[PDB]
Design a protein around this ligand. Sequence first.
Ligand SMILES: [Cl-]
Ligand SMILES: [Cl-]
Ligand SMILES: [Mg+2]
Ligand SMILES: [Mg+2]
Ligand SMILES: [Mg+2]
Ligand SMILES: [Mg+2]
Ligand SMILES: [Mg+2]
Ligand SMILES: [Mg+2]
Ligand SMILES: [Mg+2]
Ligand SMILES: [Mg+2]
Ligand SMILES: [Mg+2]
Ligand SMILES: [Mg+2]
Ligand SMILES: [Mg+2]
Ligand SMILES: [Mg+2]
Ligand SMILES: [Mg+2]
Ligand SMILES: [Mg+2]
Ligand SMILES: [Mg+2]
Ligand SMILES: [Mg+2]
Ligand SMILES: [Mg+2]
Ligand SMILES: [Mg+2]
Ligand SMILES: [Mg+2]
Ligand SMILES: [Mg+2]
Ligand SMILES: [Mg+2]
Ligand SMILES: [Mg+2]
Ligand SMILES: [Mg+2]
Ligand SMILES: [Mg+2]
Ligand SMILES: [Mg+2]
Ligand SMILES: [Mg+2]
Ligand SMILES: [Mg+2]
Ligand SMILES: [Mg+2]
Ligand SMILES: [Mg+2]
Ligand SMILES: [Mg+2]
Ligand SMILES: [Mg+2]
Ligand SMILES: [Mg+2]
Ligand SMILES: [Mg+2]
Ligand SMILES: [Zn+2]
Lengths: 105, 159, 56, 204
Amino acid sequence: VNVPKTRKTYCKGKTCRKHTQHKVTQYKAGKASLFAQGKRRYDRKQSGFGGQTKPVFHKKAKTTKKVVLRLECVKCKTRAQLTLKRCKHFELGGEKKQKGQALQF
Amino acid sequence: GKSHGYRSRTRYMFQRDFRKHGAVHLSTYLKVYKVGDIVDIKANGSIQKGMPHKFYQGKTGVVYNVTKSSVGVIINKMVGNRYLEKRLNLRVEHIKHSKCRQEFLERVKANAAKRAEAKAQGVAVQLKRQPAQPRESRIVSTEGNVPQTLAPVPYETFI
Amino acid sequence: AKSKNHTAHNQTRKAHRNGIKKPKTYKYPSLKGVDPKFRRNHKHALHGTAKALAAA
Amino acid sequence: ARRPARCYRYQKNKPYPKSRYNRAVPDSKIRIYDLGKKKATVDEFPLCVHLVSNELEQLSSEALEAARICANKYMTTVSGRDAFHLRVRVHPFHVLRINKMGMRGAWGKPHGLAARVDIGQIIFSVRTKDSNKDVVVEGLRRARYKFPGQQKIILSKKWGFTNLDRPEYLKKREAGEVKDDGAFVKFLSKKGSLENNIREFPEY
RNA sequence: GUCGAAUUUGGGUAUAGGGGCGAAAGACUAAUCGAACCAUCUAGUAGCUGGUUCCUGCCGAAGUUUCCCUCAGGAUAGCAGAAGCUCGUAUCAGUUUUAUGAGGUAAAGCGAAUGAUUAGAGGUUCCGGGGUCUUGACCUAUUCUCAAACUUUAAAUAUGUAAGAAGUCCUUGUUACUUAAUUGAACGUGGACAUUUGAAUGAAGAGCUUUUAGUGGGCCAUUUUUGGUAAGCAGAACUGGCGAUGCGGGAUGAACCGAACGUAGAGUUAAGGUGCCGGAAUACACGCUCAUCAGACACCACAAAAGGUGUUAG
RNA sequence: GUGAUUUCUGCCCAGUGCUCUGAAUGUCAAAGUGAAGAAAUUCAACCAAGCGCGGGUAAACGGCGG
RNA sequence: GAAGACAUUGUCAGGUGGGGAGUUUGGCUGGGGCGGCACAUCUGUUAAACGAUAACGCAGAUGUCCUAAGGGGGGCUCAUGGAGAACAGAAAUCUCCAGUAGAACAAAAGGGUAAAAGCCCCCUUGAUUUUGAUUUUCAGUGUGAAUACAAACCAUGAAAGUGUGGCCUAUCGAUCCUUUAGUCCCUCGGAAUUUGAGGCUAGAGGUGCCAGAAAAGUUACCACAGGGAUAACUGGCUUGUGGCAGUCAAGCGUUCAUAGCGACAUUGCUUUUUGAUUCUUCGAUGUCGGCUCUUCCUAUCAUACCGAAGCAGAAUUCGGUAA
RNA sequence: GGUUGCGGCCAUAUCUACCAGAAAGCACCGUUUCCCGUCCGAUCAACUGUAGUUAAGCUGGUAAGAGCCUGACCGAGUAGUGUAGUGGGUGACCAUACGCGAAACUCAGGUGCUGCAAUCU
Ligand SMILES: [Cl-]
Ligand SMILES: [Cl-]
Ligand SMILES: [Mg+2]
Ligand SMILES: [Mg+2]
Ligand SMILES: [Mg+2]
Ligand SMILES: [Mg+2]
Ligand SMILES: [Mg+2]
Ligand SMILES: [Mg+2]
Ligand SMILES: [Mg+2]
Ligand SMILES: [Mg+2]
Ligand SMILES: [Mg+2]
Ligand SMILES: [Mg+2]
Ligand SMILES: [Mg+2]
Ligand SMILES: [Mg+2]
Ligand SMILES: [Mg+2]
Ligand SMILES: [Mg+2]
Ligand SMILES: [Mg+2]
Ligand SMILES: [Mg+2]
Ligand SMILES: [Mg+2]
Ligand SMILES: [Mg+2]
Ligand SMILES: [Mg+2]
Ligand SMILES: [Mg+2]
Ligand SMILES: [Mg+2]
Ligand SMILES: [Mg+2]
Ligand SMILES: [Mg+2]
Ligand SMILES: [Mg+2]
Ligand SMILES: [Mg+2]
Ligand SMILES: [Mg+2]
Ligand SMILES: [Mg+2]
Ligand SMILES: [Mg+2]
Ligand SMILES: [Mg+2]
Ligand SMILES: [Mg+2]
Ligand SMILES: [Mg+2]
Ligand SMILES: [Mg+2]
Ligand SMILES: [Mg+2]
Ligand SMILES: [Zn+2]
């Protein structure tokens, strides 16, 4: 699928409260912290004798991940998130469809 | 596996009538519906929005809500050993006024007219419908209508 | 070992022991799902006619 | 390699014709349904004799083929090559299935063709001259042994293969309302434009 | 079998249980060995098998829905009991009627669409091919035969709603909704119309709440119906039964026919019977049948194609 | 491991193991070292054996087709 | 004498470690296994004209694809056939006529659609924000999908209007944890500032056994609880298959259907074959064959008496009464 | 009654082949400076009502016309179907009892009706 890098949409930024211009990017998770409470608990539980104390998922079935777009307002820099359907190939660049031409080579 | 989609088994139910395809006539959109009206549900296959589920095909209900291009209808549905109230949001293309009670209104009007007509002089106006009664006696004349004798006919092949 | 899959035998007889109850009808039914704009004005209309009868 | 006919005698299943859902049906054993002098004029063969079923059953395409050969062979030998017109009035369109090897996945493969006949349904029709009545009746009598169930031979009171009684057909032809069109005829109606109904049937 | 040796054997001594010992068989380790014996943890856990102790009275089931590493088990809804509560025929009904809807099955149809399909006939080519005229291909008018996943038409049986007081009519109050507009919408004040008050029949009263048992292997018969050559086979639909049920009948039999049960007396019947067994006419009446394998009563305990100057009627 | 004597024990080191006075800038723990921050901390460089790479080995396990 | 701050020993860290320990090693299923997915879903049919309805029934499909193939507006009309135009031919481009859709609409199928829902062109991001109600599966829980409004902000068009993704019917995911956005709000409990951590609201990372445990084999050394709810013998139902017997008569037989045979078809019988089924038995009915011994059936190999022949004799062949 | 604008039901209105049409209306028709749109002022836009024509559109009538519509004790109380019997039949299936009741076929008739506004021998 092809999605433009710019889109006009509602901005609930307490100063816009209306449709504004937004920059479009792709969401990325980010590194997990070593001092999150869930991480601190896991390290304590895993220490000592007893082996692995939590399940480890193996039976993967999905072949795709949902794409999330991060929309940043150009005026107030307020971010928003949108989720698209599952797809195998995703791009943000241009190269729009040509209406009709001869198939080269 | 089995298939139980929303429009399952509706191959013939939602089809248009023969030589009756195309756009809907304007009289469908000009009728007015009010809360308390009695309507019956018949889906139109050419209008995919606001279409009822196949269960409510051929059912009759009472309007409870009026919106821009649709009405709200109440249907009593039998589930298990009881009846549950169902509320439907249907566009006007799929409904029409029911005549199961419009014919009843004129009987109320005629009862009042007959009651007032006999009020000044008559008693026992008898404003109750009665079932068909056994025929009374009559005399059948044979003048020009002498009975014709009939007999069973023999078996013939005539193939 | 294979067993039976499905049947509706005896189900109607069970439903008729105490069932088939027509729904109870009430005056003043619930206004759930009614158009919010109509209900906003209907509330104001009822307050106005309450004052008139009380002050009559 | 073929099961006995008692295994498929009765109409137990719904009709199962050759279609885009089968696509693998073998050909029928009978391919010719008109025998004798099929070019004969309607006025040539006034007498009609039928072989009529008296049971609700199925007739295999092998049985139809065998009975057709027996009837044609006898009548040709006795009466003559061009002295009758024999028509088979049943076409085998029902496909039979056979389960070849427990009961898991028992849906069978196509096995053959059969024709589903009703009570009083015509199976064979023969038209010939009046003087040739006894020959064609005996030919149909010998064909009954190839079929299961009970069949009856009835002398029709129609004119040949037409749907009109013999006196009624004679009435129309003397009025110039019958035109010969191949082996069959066309009739003149009271409807339609006179411009077409005049060039046809000029004698009327 | 072996019998002077890798011989046989007494006593002493060493190796102890995931250990020992084994010229190796998972062999032997006190009648115990693919991990000894003894006591304790220990009344170890079991969706699995067995058993579970007095009487009478009243009511009285389920093998079905959804979810579960769920398929010999549970939860959940249903069916059942008990406790009642609010009321006193209000209103309701496994039913009919009248008025008004919905459906695409049985049947029917193919010189109606789609798809199959037999046979000619009249026409058509600078647009199939042999030959200087034939077979194919379409065109037009006809003709024989078909469809669970074809159809114009279209039942029967089932199925939605309505038949009044929460109704109808006359007048005019409220609003921030709606209208060009006191226009409309919705909800109200006041007046008029009583139970032949708006069809039939019935109604050991109607409405309502809490709580909890068992059950969640079913099976059979008529009709509809799928797979299979078929099955006392496998799987569905509606209803009635068995299971949970004796009693009269079918000799005998869970399901068929009749009929359902407090203790007795009398009378009358059901289904089935009345030569004898065996309660009841070796009754009445018109015919048919003679078998050197007659026949004899639904479910049901089998017989066919094809034949006979046997006999009878047509 | 094979199993007196006699006679003979062929070809295959790609795979799985075993082995090497082989190579270096692959992967790489704790401690230690550096930078940043007010600190908790974070990042980076360096980095043992093993692994990887290279050689040897079938009377090692095994293989000997179209 | 040797050896020396190195070995050794102590504590952490990385590797190696079936030598050893603990545990696991789906379900449905005409027994189980192998296969398959009927395990989460969609179209048509089976389905018996409301709704609901089974089988490892029948014919297929889904874990995708699209900045347009989404939204609005305008103009236009398709498949196919006929008659024509240099190269040009059955198929290149141009013109006219006929054309109810026989085209097209991402995909399976069924519906739907013609001044359109199809084709071309112009403009756009409503595939947006907040939080409720409703329909389907249903326990009237969840999840998925879908319908109609309310309050905002926008797109398009002269305008009425239309638009909360794809013409409609499938295209998908809890708790815990992690992470992002929002609000910059609440808490760190002796009092404050700044980091850090923890909460509130909305998404993402996935469980396909799809209401969602983290999981390899073998036992012919075997164990226990059970099961005739379920397989390996008889018996019972069935008879496809096996075996046996009729009917018809095109033909074989030098002539000549039927002495003896007999195609194409068709009706049965038998339980001495094998399947199908799973009713009885798993707190046990001793399991192949032979040996020994008795009796029964007749579909008769021999013996008794007969009929028939393409029966001269001889020999043989067909049939009857007969166990 | 004719005609025009906007309609309702959506073939009794459609289709094929012909014939006729006073008045007005509608239409064809004339032109390219302007707004506007095309390869083409053909379509679309604008201007004139002047130069012409009822030829076509349009409306009506005609046809043992096709289609369509309505009715018929035409077919037919037939096919099918609810309920019942210890009815028939080896079976396949069938008859009867109390009810409901088609389609094709055949024949006959019909060939748009109508609402609002304006206008015309
Ligand atoms: Cl049951
Ligand atoms: Cl010891
Ligand atoms: Mg540790
Ligand atoms: Mg949509
Ligand atoms: Mg069960
Ligand atoms: Mg038979
Ligand atoms: Mg089969
Ligand atoms: Mg010794
Ligand atoms: Mg061993
Ligand atoms: Mg105990
Ligand atoms: Mg114990
Ligand atoms: Mg009781
Ligand atoms: Mg048990
Ligand atoms: Mg259907
Ligand atoms: Mg039919
Ligand atoms: Mg149980
Ligand atoms: Mg069973
Ligand atoms: Mg029991
Ligand atoms: Mg008996
Ligand atoms: Mg006696
Ligand atoms: Mg040696
Ligand atoms: Mg140490
Ligand atoms: Mg182990
Ligand atoms: Mg299993
Ligand atoms: Mg249905
Ligand atoms: Mg689209
Ligand atoms: Mg503190
Ligand atoms: Mg699940
Ligand atoms: Mg798991
Ligand atoms: Mg059993
Ligand atoms: Mg056989
Ligand atoms: Mg015993
Ligand atoms: Mg014994
Ligand atoms: Mg024993
Ligand atoms: Mg009965
Ligand atoms: Zn902003």
